[PDB]
Each structure stands twice: as structure tokens, then as C-alpha cells.
Amino acid sequence: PVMADLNGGLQFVPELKEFTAKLRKELVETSEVRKAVSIETALEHKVV
């Protein structure tokens, strides 16, 4: 019987769980803050 590790090396990056859970927790921040800052400046531009 053979095993065939077609894994890119993801057994080496250590503590991948939150290493993963951080990469996306940042992609929602950088996404949502540029959702909120963008709409209010566009809203700022509507009161001046």
C-alpha cells in the first residue's frame, strides 16, 4: 500500500489553524473598514 502526499507542504507551516484564521480575519477588517470609511466620506461629500 502506498501513500501519496499531494500536500504542498501544509504539514510544515506550524499552527496553521489560526495562521489561517488570521489571514481571513484580516481580510474582513481591511474589507469592512474600506466599506465603512468609503461610505461615510461619500456621505461626508453629501453634507458639505
CB of 29 to other proteins, least distance (A): 28
7 binds other proteins (CB under 8 A): no
DSSP-derived secondary structure letter, 9:
S
CB of 14 to other proteins, least distance (A): 5
11 binds other proteins (CB under 8 A): yes
CB burial of residue 2 (10 Å; 0-12, 13-18, 19+): exposed
- Report residue 17 as a C-alpha cell: 489553524
**What CA–CA distance (Å, rounded) separates 22 from 18?**
5
Q: Which is nearer to other proteins, 11 or 31 (CB)?
A: 11
Binding footprint of other proteins on the chain (CB under 8 A): 11-12, 14
